[PDB]
Every structure is written in structure tokens, then in C-alpha cells.
Symmetry: D4
């Protein structure tokens, strides 16, 4: 093809993030060269998940997102058959060994209130913790339990607003927002 | 030869783990290409020991397992002639500088209760701490003192159940369980 | 799934070869975990192509195989619009800057005579050079022009027979041969 | 040219520090080969900023100094539009996620009291924290809040006095002091 | 700013090429973020020079392009005061130790005949060899002496046409051609 | 020459430790090939100092030992002119930023009581803290303030007894002990 | 144990050479700590083989020595079933793709004439080329065909005499010579 | 001390060159901080020797310069007891396996004719080849046999004149020339 968004995504995100996002879309029958808005979203969600796991202790989180579907479900079964928690219907993003619960990370271009409403509607397993971030700097989690420290979450939202600025500077933000 | 277990072991474990396990069996007159079930067990026990030492403080543990028999006993003598603890009859796996005791790590495919019964029967030195893990997610230690934090131990059992799933997915689990 | 061939492929070939083969099959809607015979073939063809380009001078060959379909065709157009050769109907494997022709590399489990007959039947552009290798140690090229030196080609066939031996040692050769 | 200060700067500071300082001066139309005193000052200020961020927690500080003017302001806007603090008139050096304020780092060859008087006079945004260091071993911060621990600040001043000694040993300190 | 050409340049060329081009423009008071067409040209000319020096023997070429103006002239003086050749009026790109002459590399978007006419008009020192490349695949050198082997030059023009295709695929080729 | 001690020292200690010890002896007009007992002692003292600084916080210690005499004294002057402590008569080994004092590390083959008696007799500056270790597992520090945690010191003495065992295993311990 | 030869071997040879020699002896039920003379010989023979393969073209030699017995025989079968040469009775050291023959490398402490007499007596396959080196600087090969260039062989014998000097300098040469 | 020459030497030469030169002077009881002119000369002679060995084939030269006095003489004895050449009275710089002779490399600030006259007067062994270079671009060797190709020698003299220019640019050339 030849989109501005694709070149910006490769310039904005770490190369391993781009490769993992490409593998995730190709596993789900998606092309980064055509669905470039989803390409930027999957890269953003990937980085947010990794910065999230970077916060806290060393052995606190088990990273579910970023693995292939078979191995991700294998780790989920291992975590469930070990601690005793219920197997979630859909694949979560992380598992907290400190709080003993799965975490679903969300990144939205609209109000954080609407996304969780759809995220909580889909996620039937109420045990799975939900934590939403927005590109405007807002966040909200289940039971107001934000899991990480304030500084780690502040670093996440700062990065999100930086991605938003870089997108608007090259005039891809408008098409990126009205596409979720 | 040409066993499925040998190729799975090389694909499942870190290369340095495989090399250390090979050296340990060859030091005891064992061939990984024929005794592939023991090959997978020595790799599993090696990784569990290293994840165990990864938990806790930086200078907490001295790693006895993974060294050659002569150097491992040299470190054991050094630890004994320093702190003043009794020299164990058999080589332990770790030494805890925080609790001032040797640690014997066990990984079992049967009930954790039976192994320790044999492990405690062999280990005459009652000072040596014993900590057993199972592939089903169970654990138990001497005096109910589990040494590490809950998250580090939970990560160990999750990995053990993942190895069990990968083994059963390729139909090596049955021959691996009824072989201990 | 859980196939012996998949674990052998990951143990036999270089990791970057495995990743490039995975991307090539996923680009063509193929799963390495199910089509493990094709997984071993695409890895073998990939390595043969890279050893082939390793023979000769430094700037002799342009590597077409291993790139994504869009970039591979981009390099082919560049080579054609530069030297003046005709654009081949299908994607070749290499381009020889010394002989000024595209090269199609083939690896077969049957007689080398049959494959080229199908390869030359498909390849309408007679300018594209064809070079076939077999797992038994045979080779043959267009116009009896074998391009590389004898030692580089001998190293290629030696590797092919080593892959064949390792496959038969674990009893995957029979299913691999009667699958082409 | 051919100044002793330029060769000392390249020998005294880390290579990446020298490259970042060169880019900062060239961005502001300055030549390190002629303004060698400013070359040593920008390297010193750069290293002090990086040692400052090295103190404290992992996610505590966002490093503003060292980036290009456009990206530095992009991060500042991100931090402001996230936490809600006021946009400073001039570019600060760091942002504290723990104290929720921007930090302006200063390094002086005169009394620390005079510099801050000029630094606080320029910085209209009173929210921005100011922290001055001197080459004699003195320091002072806004509201007597020195942000970091005593050991991290002591390491900073020790390095500053070491740079001063190395400068005087080669007879560049006198021209470096009477040049601020 | 926010140009498509800038993100494509960072995605198309090697990172060290981009950094060297940035330093060359900033040394001459030029901004890559605004003069993005010149940004792509200086990166292209830089890579062509490095591929050119990559052809031939190990100690054949001395690379003049890519150094700062002071050090580049220092190497030119060294070469002149050693071999005895005349000092060129303007900075050349390479020096051939085999042919004992300086080389001026040119990359053009128009006919190679016009550029050399301007290049030979500017270069008063007739000893300096001139070698022009075009994005269409044409080349021509002084006295029809093309210095390198055919394969090394063919690789250069293939890369040039690949850059041209990638530019046209994202619709920057038209503005890049009508800008020389 | 050709001593067993020299080959054991190179096999027992880290290569950078050996190089730093060689530079220290050559700076004081000493040859490692002839004074091999001192070679083993300077390597042992070097490693103990580095393990000592490895204990505690990140910015706690400034490492004086291991630098050249001029730079070591330069750091000592920097520390003194910063904190305000008195300049010691002889070069110490470390500086504690937490306790604000210099540390003199000693390793002995005799009773720890005798060495400190000579160490405290030489060190006139009573502010400098003294910490002695022995190859038998004993330690003692000024004012019974052992600075580090018990685990870090236990790791130091364990290493010392391991060096003693390796020396006696090759029959260099007797000549090493009766040589201090 | 505690031998001077073992520490000298670890100090004299490259670490990977030492590891490969250890694996070769342990595969044949041999201990480097007790049979230290054989330890030095297997390291010497290993290095000579690798320097030998280092001479000549890039794809000239296939390295048989240094692999495990199963994989070494697998490569030998591949070479035989490819070129058509006869399978040797015992494992050779190299294969020459240029001369199409296996090479048996020998290193001796006695006269080169006696070793080959035993080497040629054992090696029934007359096709296998034999090339002997001595620690005194002598060499001789089958049919006076020395395979490599004079400089590569001269470098091999120079290294052999250097190992001999280092051995005699520490008084292990006498026990090493009267032990073959 | 604090000399301009010392900082220029560390900035001009590769770090390993500086370390090897420091070890050579300290082995001969010389201080780089005081004899900075000799410091620059030993670095220059070291680099010239390494560029000289870089010319030619892979196994052509054995590097004598840069080793410690004991190991350098050990290699010289090995070369003599192997090829059969006479042991030189003083340590040479290289050995040519192609021409079968030792090489003495010289770098001078005066006329190349005078140095060799002293070099040939000292070197009694007429077999040792002598090759002198100057900072003005002149060279001359024994029997007019310049050993290497013209391009490799031209690269050496170009580097020498570059070092001369950098020295004069900072006003150390005059004191460096009138000091030989
Ligand atoms: C473990 C490995 C990759 C991890 C992903 C994650 C990446 C991590 C890298 C760190 C270092 N930082 C931080 C600075 C830049 C950098 O590089 N961060 C965190 C921030 C962004 C980033 O990049 N982590 C965490 C453990 C170590 C590691 O690398 N992943 C991928 C999915 C599963 C998983 O655990 N794995 C595992 C197998 C495949 C693979 O690749
Ligand atoms: C010290 C060294 C090896 C250590 C073994 C152990 C390995 C450690 C590596 C870490 C990093 N991680 C974690 C992520 C992947 C990785 O790589 N972990 C822990 C988890 C799995 C793993 O691999 N550790 C601990 C100290 C540093 C180190 O590497 N061993 C081997 C036996 C004795 C010993 O202390 N030694 C010592 C001499 C020989 C040798 O090899
Ligand atoms: C260029 C790069 C990868 C190349 C593929 C190829 C791999 C090469 C690696 C060499 C080194 N050896 C040899 C010993 C082990 C090793 O590692 N060999 C040859 C033998 C097997 C192997 O692995 N080559 C050749 C140039 C350098 C390089 O690496 N490819 C991939 C497809 C296109 C291409 O040119 N590229 C290009 C962009 C993406 C990428 O990855
Ligand atoms: C992130 C990266 C560079 C960082 C600058 C800073 C450098 C850091 C390096 C550490 C490791 N240490 C310590 C020992 C020697 C060394 O090397 N320290 C701190 C002390 C001196 C030093 O050097 N840090 C902090 C995060 C990791 C890193 O490297 N910078 C540059 C400006 C913005 C920024 O965050 N970035 C970001 C994009 C461009 C770039 O280069
Ligand atoms: C010497 C060094 C940089 C060189 C530039 C040039 C780069 C070279 C790198 C090679 C390896 N390849 C090839 C594959 C990818 C890669 O990386 N190629 C050639 C092709 C593209 C490329 O990148 N070369 C040549 C010598 C070694 C080296 O790296 N330059 C920069 C200007 C002057 C100079 O000689 N220098 C010198 C001082 C500053 C610096 O950086
Ligand atoms: C800073 C640098 C070297 C330091 C010496 C010291 C070495 C440190 C290395 C660590 C990593 N570990 C631990 C595992 C193996 C290893 O490697 N440890 C500690 C244990 C043994 C060891 O080796 N440290 C501490 C800071 C980082 C570093 O490396 N030194 C040398 C004298 C002054 C000094 O600060 N410097 C400074 C300039 C010259 C030089 O070399
Ligand atoms: C291929 C790899 C190892 C090779 C052994 C051999 C080692 C080679 C290393 C080179 C680089 N140099 C030279 C300077 C120092 C160094 O390091 N040289 C030659 C001189 C001494 C030395 O060390 N070679 C040759 C190919 C690349 C390589 O490394 N071997 C081991 C047995 C089989 C084999 O081919 N393999 C293969 C699989 C296991 C393994 O380890
Ligand atoms: C072998 C090793 C060091 C060698 C010295 C020499 C250095 C060589 C490095 C090359 C790569 N290049 C070239 C580009 C930059 C670089 O780095 N060049 C040549 C040009 C300048 C330079 O630096 N060579 C040659 C063989 C490989 C090597 O590195 N030496 C030191 C004295 C004896 C010796 O053979 N050794 C041997 C044991 C101690 C040690 O260190
Ligand atoms: C939709 O196809 C996929 C599927 C996967 C595997 C699991 N996916 C997630 O877990 C996940 N997906 C999204 C997302 C992103 C873009 C468009 C729509 C959605 C719903 N957002 C999340 O927050 C999140 O956790 C990976 C990548 N793409
Ligand atoms: C049995 O030969 C060996 C010996 C060693 C050295 C010391 N071994 C242990 O310390 C150890 N061995 C086992 C184990 C594993 C497989 C079969 C039987 C046993 C008892 N399990 C442990 O938990 C454990 O600590 C290493 C490897 N193999
Ligand atoms: C078939 O889907 C693909 C397609 C590609 C891209 C281009 N492919 C080739 O160029 C190519 N393909 C084969 C091959 C391998 C397995 C089964 C059938 C065939 C015909 N053999 C070759 O020799 C060869 O050059 C890559 C991978 N898989
Ligand atoms: C003046 O041109 C520049 C500008 C920048 C970007 C932002 N600059 C700072 O933020 C900054 N500048 C100094 C400084 C240093 C030398 C002379 C005068 C001053 C005022 N001192 C600081 O403490 C400080 O934070 C970087 C480099 N040079
Ligand atoms: C014009 O400012 C500069 C100057 C330099 C230093 C030396 N420059 C060259 O040597 C050189 N410059 C060009 C070029 C590129 C874009 C626009 C105009 C020109 C004439 N083309 C070449 O072929 C070439 O050799 C580096 C970068 N920019
Ligand atoms: C003897 O046990 C082994 C066996 C192997 C595998 C194959 N061995 C050889 O190929 C080989 N062995 C020697 C050698 C060395 C010491 C003592 C006796 C001999 C005969 N010398 C060679 O030249 C040579 O090629 C490796 C190591 N040790
Ligand atoms: C003089 O002390 C040393 C000795 C060595 C070991 C062997 N030295 C040489 O081989 C050598 N020495 C010089 C040189 C350099 C400066 C002043 C005087 C001389 C004669 N010039 C050479 O060309 C040369 O080959 C290394 C370093 N310094
Ligand atoms: Mn997810
Ligand atoms: Mn999610
Ligand atoms: Mn054990
Ligand atoms: Mn155990
Ligand atoms: Mn193909
Ligand atoms: Mn093909
Ligand atoms: Mn600033
Ligand atoms: Mn500042
Ligand atoms: Mn130019
Ligand atoms: Mn040019
Ligand atoms: Mn000391
Ligand atoms: Mn001390
Ligand atoms: Mn052999
Ligand atoms: Mn042999
Ligand atoms: Mn010399
Ligand atoms: Mn010389």
C-alpha cells in the first residue's frame, strides 16, 4: 500500500512491539499494511501492557498478552489449575500474583466509561480485574482498585498523550479517533 | 536414538539449563539420549532451583545445584566452616544466608507427601530444610516454613503445570509420570 | 497440536530460519503446527537458499526468498528495471549479478528429474535459471551451468543428507518423503 | 581549532554525554570547538541531570533534558495534559511523578545563592521546583525540599568537585570559572 | 512539523545513516524536519557512498564523505601531502588508493548527463574522478572508467530504484523528483 | 618464571580483577610473576572490596580501591572537600555515603585481632572505619559496627574459605599463609 | 585433585576448546582432573584441527572433530553418501571438499615418523589423508601432499612450540613427553 | 600532572592501543603522564604495526609487538625453532610467514634515512627486514622490498600525516618533533 500511519507506527514503537503486533494480527487474519489504524492500536495496547507489568515487584505479573493463542491459553490453564481461580471466557492480558486475579487492560479513544461498560458486559467472569486507560489521561479500574502505584500509571498516560500528539502532528489522529 | 522427549526437552528449556543437566548426568554416568525421562526431570529440577534462588534478596541464596560434585562440596565446606552448621550427608540444592540453613528442592509427579517422606528419611541432618513442589500445583516445606514469598512460589508451580501441559500435548506425560 | 516434526524442526534449524519460514506460511495462510511436513520443507528450502547465496563473491547474489511478497516483488522490479531482464511470472529465489539471471532453487524428496520438469513447465520465462537439489545427494541445473563452485554445492547436499538422517532417526522421514 | 578543553571534555565525560551536548549546542547555533567552556558546562549539566534521575525509584522521574526541543516540549505537554500542572514558560530538566512537579537543575561556578536568584527570577511558574548544585560542594533547593536522598546528592557534588580538580590540574579551571 | 517523508526516511535508511545525514545538514544550517526532500537525498547519497566503498579491496578507498568538515579536510590534506595529488577546490566523497585519485559521487533524479555537466563545471581539478548514478538505473563516470566491478555498481542502482519505488508507493516521489 | 600460584590466580579470579591487581603491583614496582603470593593477596583483597561495595544500596559506596594512585586521591579529596571529613593519611578502600566515613578493608591469613592492631596503629585518622576479614571465617570492625548486612558479609567469608580450599588442594596454602 | 597441568591447560587454551575437550573425554569415560596429560593433548589436538580448518577457502573443510560421536558419524555418512567416498573405519578429523578426502590430524611428542606408522597401520581406508605435526616443528603428510599453504602450517607448528615452551617453563613438559 | 598531549593521545588513539602502550612503558619503567611525547610515539608505533599486519593475507604475519617481553620472546623462539631463522639480538615487531623473515617497524619525525642507519647499526642480524615510515609521507625498506601492497602502505602514511596535523592544530607538534 503506502500509508503514513504504517511508517509512523514503525518509527514510534519499539521494533519488537511492532513484530509482536504483526504476529497477533496475522494470527487473526489481519494485515497491518491495510488496517493501519488497528496496527497503531495493537501496538499501543501491547506497550501499555508491558509498561503495566513493568510496574510493581519482579515476580508480581504473568504476561498473557503477546503470546500466541495456544501458549497464552496454556499459561492461563496453568494459573487456574495452580491458584484455583476460574478460567475466564476470553483471554485476559495479565495475571496478578499479588492480588490473585486476571487483569484486562484497555486503551480507548473515547470516554473510559463506555469501554468498560462493553468490557464488563463481555467479560462474564467477574473475578477478572478490568483497568482502562484513555488517550486524554483518564483511567479507571474495577472496585476503584488501580493495582499499581500512581507513578507507574502516570507514566502510562503520559506516553498515551505523547502518542496522541505525534499522531495529530502528522494528521493521523482524526482518522485514528473516529475508527474505534 | 531419536526420542520425542529429547527434542521437546531442548525446545522447552533454556539452552544453558540443558547443558548443565547433560553435564550432571554424564558426571553420574547417564545418557540424555536414552534416559530422556530423567533428562526432562533434571532440567525441571534445575530450573526450579534457579527460579527459587531468583526469589528473595540479592545475596540471600548460595546455589549448590548446578556445580560439579567437587566444587559443590567445596562450597558446602566453605559454608559450614563459616557459619558453623553441620555438614549434610548428601549434597543439598541451596543455602539460605537469611535463615542459615541448607535447602533441598524436590519436584515430584506423585503426591508431595510421599516424596518428602523419602527425602526426610534419606536426609539425616534435620537442619537441612526441605521444600517439595509437584506438577499438580502443590507444595510443602519443613515446619510449614516456605522460605520465599507466595508470588515466587506461585510462579514456580505455574511453570511446572505448563511443562506438564506441553508434555501431555505431545503424549509424553503418561510415560513421564509412571517413571519416577 | 503436539507433533514430533515441529519440535525436531525447531531443534534442527537456526531460530531465524524458523521465524522466516513461519512468516512465509502465515502469509500464505498456512499453520506450522498442523502442516509440519511443509514446515520442515520451507525451513530446508530457506537454508539451502541462504547457503547458496553464501557461495561466491560478496556482491554476487541478491536474495529474493525470505522477504515478504510485496518487498520481494519490489526488489524483482528494481532488478528488472536496472539490468533489463524480463520480469518472471512467479517469484524466483535469487538473482545472479555475475551471470545476470534469476535463480529458482528447488529441494526435492523424489528424483531431481521430475521436479525440474514441473519447475520448467511452470516457469515460462526461460531466462530464469533453475537449480535443483535432492535429499539423496543429486543436483542438476539449467544448461548444466551449476553457477557455484563444487565445494559450495557439496556442502549443500551434505547438509540435505544430514537432515534426512536426523529425520529417519526419529521416524519422520517416511511421512516426510511420501508427502511432496 | 585545537583547545585543551575540548580534548579534556571528550576524555572526562561519557561519549553519549558528549554527543547529546553537541546536538544541544548545534540545535542552538553553538560550536563546541570554539565555545569549549560552554561545551564543558553543557556536559556537566547533562551528567548531573542523569545522575539526579538515577536517584530514587524506577518510574519516579521523566527526563526532559537531553531531548530535542520539539520532543522535550511534547513530553512537557503530555505531562501537563495528564496530571494537570501548569505549562512552564521555559523548558525544565525533569518531572517528579512522586512530588508532581517539574524540576530545574542548575550547576554553578559561583555562589549557589546568586544563580537561583536569577533562576527563580526567570522561572515565573512557581510550581517548578529548583535545585542548584555548585562545584564547591554546596546545594540548595526550593522550600528546602531536596527531593532525593542525601547519598545520591552527595555523589553528585563529589563528581562536581572531581571535574573541578581535573580542570585545575590541566589549568582550565580559571578560564572556566570566570566565564559563567 | 509532521511530514510523511521524514517518517519514511527513518524507516527506509539505516539509523546511523540517518544520524550522519542529520549532522551534515545541521553543520550546514539545515533542518531535516522541514527540508525533508533534502533529508532523503543526503541519506541516499550517504548510502551510495558507503556501498561504493564496500566494493573493491579492503584498503582501497578512504571515505571522505560522512566526516565533519574539519576532519574531512584534514584527511584530504593528509592524502594530498602523502601521494602528491592536487588539493581539490571542494570536498570529494572518496579517495581511490588503487587509482590514486579522488572520487565525487553523484545521485540524480534527472538525466545523468546534466548533473555531471554541472559537477564537472564546478570541479576545476580535472584529476578528481566523477561517477554519477541515477534513480532510473543509469550511470556514467569520467573517461568511461567505472572504477568498481559491474556487480557492485548493479547493486547500487538496484537499491536506488528500490528507494524510488518505495517513495512512489507512498506518493512522495513526485515531490522528490521535481525538487532537485 | 613458571609458578603454580600464577596459573591458579588466573584460573580462580575474574579476568578484570587480575588486570587491576597487575596494574596496582606494577604501579608500586612489583612483578606478579615472581611475587605470586602477593599476586593472590591483591586479587583477594580486590574481590573482597568489590563484593563489599556490592552489598547495601546503589549509591551507598564510593570505590577508592582499584583506581590509580592519582585518581584515587582525587576522589578522596572530592569526598573530603564535599562532606567535610578529614583527609586520611593513607589511601582507604571505600567511602560510605550512608555512615559518612572512609572504610579500610583488610584480609588476613592470621588472627583478625593482630592485623587491625597494626591497621589501627598505622591509620592515625580515627574517623576511618576498619573492617577485617580472615580466611578462617572471622571478621571484626570498628566499634562493632559491621556496616553491611549479615548475608553480604557471610558471602564474603564463604568466598574466602573457598579460595583457601582451592589453594590447599593444589598445595599453595602453606606457602601462602607463612608469607603475610 | 589439584594439578599444575590442569590450571595451565585452562590458562593456555581458549575456554571453548577446554569445554569441547572435557566433553570428548567424558564421552569416552575420562576425567580431566586426573588424566591431565591427556587433557593437554586433547586440547592441543582440538586447536590444531581448528587452525587447520581455518586455513584455505571458506567452504573447503567440514569439521568432524569436536562433535559428539553420534553427530560426527552422521556427518561422515552424509559426506560418504554424497560424494561417494568409502566410509572410514575410525572417525577422521576433517573432510576436504577441494581434494575430496578425509583428513586425520595427528600431534606427537616423538618423531613424526613413528606416529604415522601407527596411524597408517590403524587407518585401513587408504583414501583417508594423514597429516602429522610435532612439538619440535616437523610435519609430514600422505603422498607429500600437505593440503594447506606453507604459512598456515607454519603458524600451526609455531603454536605447538609455544605450548611446549610454556609447559617446560612450569616443569610439566618432561611428564608430558614421556606419557604419549 | 595535566598535559595537553596526554588528553590528545587518549582522544586520538583507540583505547586498547592506549592500554597496550601504557603497559609497555610501565614494563620499561616509564610513566605516560610525564613522558607524554614518548606516550604519543609508542601509541603511533603500535598502531602502525597493527595496520601493517592488517595488510596482506590472513595468516601472513605473526605480531610480536604488543606482547609482554617474556611472551614476545617466547613467540620469537617458537618462530626460530620452527622455520630455522636466526634469533635476533633485539625484539622485532613482526614476522613474515610469506617471506620468512622478521620485520622491524620504525616511525620517525626526522629523515627516514637517518633512523634506518641507526636501526641497521643496532640490528646485527642482517636477516631481519627493516621498514621505516615518516610523518611526512616517506618510507623505505631493506633491499627496496616494501613487503606490503602500495595501498596498505599509503593508508599508513596518510594516518601518520593526520596525526601530525592534529598535533600541530593543538600546538604539540613542535615539542613532539624536537624530542626524538
Ligand atoms: C520475556 C520475553 C519478552 C516479554 C516482554 C517484556 C518486554 C520488556 C523488555 C524490557 C527489558 N525493556 C524495558 C525497556 C526497554 C526494554 O526492552 N518491556 C517492558 C517495557 C517495554 C518492553 O519492551 N519482558 C518482560 C520480561 C522480560 C521482557 O523482555 N514477553 C513477551 C510476551 C510474553 C513475555 O513475557 N519473551 C517471552 C517469550 C517470548 C519473548 O520474547
Ligand atoms: C552464575 C552462573 C550461572 C548460575 C545460574 C543462575 C542463572 C540465572 C540467569 C538469570 C540472569 N536469568 C533469569 C532470566 C533468564 C536468565 O538467564 N537464572 C535464574 C532463572 C533461570 C536462570 O537461568 N544465575 C544466578 C547468578 C547469576 C546467574 O547467571 N549458576 C550455575 C550454577 C551455580 C550458579 O551460581 N555460573 C556460576 C559458575 C558457572 C555459571 O555458569
Ligand atoms: C540480511 C538479513 C538476513 C538475510 C539472510 C542471510 C543470513 C545469513 C547469516 C550469516 C551471517 N550466517 C552464516 C553463519 C550463520 C549466520 O548467521 N545466513 C547464510 C547462511 C545461513 C544464514 O543464516 N544474510 C545474507 C546477508 C547477511 C545475512 O544475514 N536476508 C533475509 C532475507 C533477505 C536477506 O538478505 N535481512 C535482510 C532484511 C531482513 C533480514 O533479516
Ligand atoms: C533512555 C535513553 C537515554 C536516556 C539517558 C539515561 C542514561 C543513563 C544510562 C545508564 C544505563 N547508565 C548508568 C551507568 C552508565 C550508564 O550508561 N545514565 C544515568 C547516569 C549516566 C547515564 O548515562 N537513561 C535513563 C533511562 C535509561 C537510560 O539510558 N535519555 C536521554 C534523554 C532522554 C532519556 O531518557 N534515550 C531515550 C531516547 C534517546 C535516548 O538515548
Ligand atoms: C568507520 C566508521 C563508520 C564508517 C562508515 C562505514 C559503514 C559500513 C558499515 C558496514 C560494517 N556495514 C555493511 C552492512 C551493514 C553495516 O553496518 N557500511 C557500508 C555499507 C553501509 C554501511 O553502513 N564503514 C566503513 C569502515 C567500517 C564502517 O563501519 N565511516 C563513517 C564516515 C567515515 C567512515 O569511515 N566510522 C569512522 C569514524 C566515525 C565512524 O562512525
Ligand atoms: C565501574 C568500573 C568497574 C568498578 C568495579 C565494580 C565491578 C563489579 C562488576 C559487577 C557488574 N559484577 C558483579 C558480578 C560480576 C560483575 O562483573 N563487581 C562487583 C563484584 C565483582 C565485580 O566485578 N563495579 C562497581 C560499579 C560497576 C562496576 O563494574 N570499578 C573499578 C575501580 C573503581 C570502580 O568503580 N570502572 C570504573 C572506572 C574503571 C572501571 O573499570
Ligand atoms: C561452528 C561452531 C564451532 C566450530 C569450531 C570453529 C571455531 C573457530 C572460531 C573462530 C571464529 N575463531 C578464530 C579466532 C578465535 C575464534 O573464536 N576457531 C578456529 C580457530 C580456533 C577457533 O576457535 N568454527 C569454525 C566455523 C565457525 C566456528 O566457530 N565447530 C565445533 C565443532 C564443529 C564445528 O564446526 N559449532 C558447530 C556446532 C557446535 C559449535 O560450537
Ligand atoms: C589478538 C589480540 C589483539 C591483537 C591486535 C590486533 C588488533 C586489530 C583489531 C582489529 C579487529 N581491528 C581493525 C579495526 C579496528 C579493530 O579493532 N587491529 C588492527 C588495526 C588496529 C587494530 O586494533 N589483532 C590482530 C588479530 C586480531 C586482533 O585483534 N594483538 C595484540 C598483540 C598481539 C596480537 O596479536 N590479542 C592477542 C593476545 C592479547 C590480545 O589482545
Ligand atoms: C481482535 O483481534 C486481535 C486479537 C488478539 C488476541 C487477544 N486480543 C485482546 O486481548 C485485546 N484486543 C483488543 C482490540 C484491538 C483492536 C480491535 C479490537 C479489539 C477488541 N483490545 C484489548 O484491550 C485486548 O486485550 C490480539 C490482537 N488482535
Ligand atoms: C541421581 O544422579 C544425579 C545426581 C546429581 C547430583 C545431586 N543430585 C541432586 O541433588 C538431586 N537429584 C534428583 C534426582 C533426579 C532424577 C532421578 C533421581 C533423583 C534423586 N532430585 C533432586 O531433587 C535433587 O536435589 C545430579 C543429577 N543426577
Ligand atoms: C506455497 O506457499 C509458499 C509460498 C512462498 C513464497 C514463494 N514460494 C517459493 O518461491 C517456493 N515454494 C516451494 C514450495 C514449498 C512447499 C510446498 C510447495 C512449494 C511450491 N518450493 C520452492 O522451491 C520455492 O522457491 C513461501 C512459502 N510457501
Ligand atoms: C543556552 O542554549 C542551550 C539550550 C539548551 C536547551 C535548554 N537549556 C537548559 O535547560 C539549560 N541551559 C543552561 C545553560 C548552559 C550554558 C549557558 C547558559 C545556560 C542557561 N543551564 C541549565 O541549567 C539548563 O537547564 C541546551 C543547551 N544549550
Ligand atoms: C549542501 O550542503 C551539504 C554539504 C555537505 C558536505 C559536502 N557535500 C557534498 O559533498 C555533496 N552534496 C550534495 C547535495 C545534496 C543536496 C543538495 C545539494 C547538494 C550539492 N550532493 C553530492 O553528491 C555531494 O558529494 C553535506 C550535506 N549537505
Ligand atoms: C581416545 O579417546 C578419545 C576419543 C575421541 C574421539 C575420536 N578421537 C580422535 O579422533 C583422536 N584421538 C587422539 C588421542 C588422544 C589422546 C590419547 C590417544 C589418542 C588416540 N589423537 C588424534 O589425533 C585423534 O584424531 C576424542 C578424545 N578422546
Ligand atoms: C624503549 O622502551 C620501550 C620498549 C618496548 C619493547 C620493544 N620496543 C620496540 O620494539 C621499539 N621501541 C621504539 C622506541 C620508542 C620510543 C623511544 C625509543 C624507542 C627505541 N621504536 C620502535 O620502532 C620499536 O620497535 C616498548 C616500548 N618502549
Ligand atoms: Mn489481550
Ligand atoms: Mn486488553
Ligand atoms: Mn541437588
Ligand atoms: Mn533437589
Ligand atoms: Mn521462492
Ligand atoms: Mn525455490
Ligand atoms: Mn534544561
Ligand atoms: Mn537546568
Ligand atoms: Mn560529498
Ligand atoms: Mn557527492
Ligand atoms: Mn586499599
Ligand atoms: Mn585494604
Ligand atoms: Mn579425531
Ligand atoms: Mn586426529
Ligand atoms: Mn618493537
Ligand atoms: Mn619498531
Amino acid at each position: 500500500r503506502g500509508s503514513h500511519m504504517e511508517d509512523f507506527v514503525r518509527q514510534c514503537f519499539n521494533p519488537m512491539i511492532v513484530e509482536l503486533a504483526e504476529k497477533a494480527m496475522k494470527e487473526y487474519g489481519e494485515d497491518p499494511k491495510i488496517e493501519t489504524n488497528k496496527f497503531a492500536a495493537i501496538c499501543t495496547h501491547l506497550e501499555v501492557c508491558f509498561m503495566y507489568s513493568d510496574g510493581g515487584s519482579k515476580h508480581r505479573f504473568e504476561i498473557i498478552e503477546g503470546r500466541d493463542r495456544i501458549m497464552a491459553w496454556t499459561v492461563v490453564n496453568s494459573i487456574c489449575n495452580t491458584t484455583g481461580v476460574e478460567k475466564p471466557k476470553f483471554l485476559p492480558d495479565l495475571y496478578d500474583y499479588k492480588e490473585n486475579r486476571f487483569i484486562e487492560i484497555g486503551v480507548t479513544r473515547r470516554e473510559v466509561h463506555i469501554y468498560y461498560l462493553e468490557k464488563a458486559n463481555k467479560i462474564k467472569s467477574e473475578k477478572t480485574h478490568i483497568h482502562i486507560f484513555s488517550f486524554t489521561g483518564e483511567e479507571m479500574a474495577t472496585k476503584a482498585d488501580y493495582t499499581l502505584d500512581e507513578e507507574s500509571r502516570a507514566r502510562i498516560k503520559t506516553r498515551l498523550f505523547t502518542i496522541r500528539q505525534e499522531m495529530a502532528s502528522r494528521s493521523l489522529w482524526d482518522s485514528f479517533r473516529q475508527s474505534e
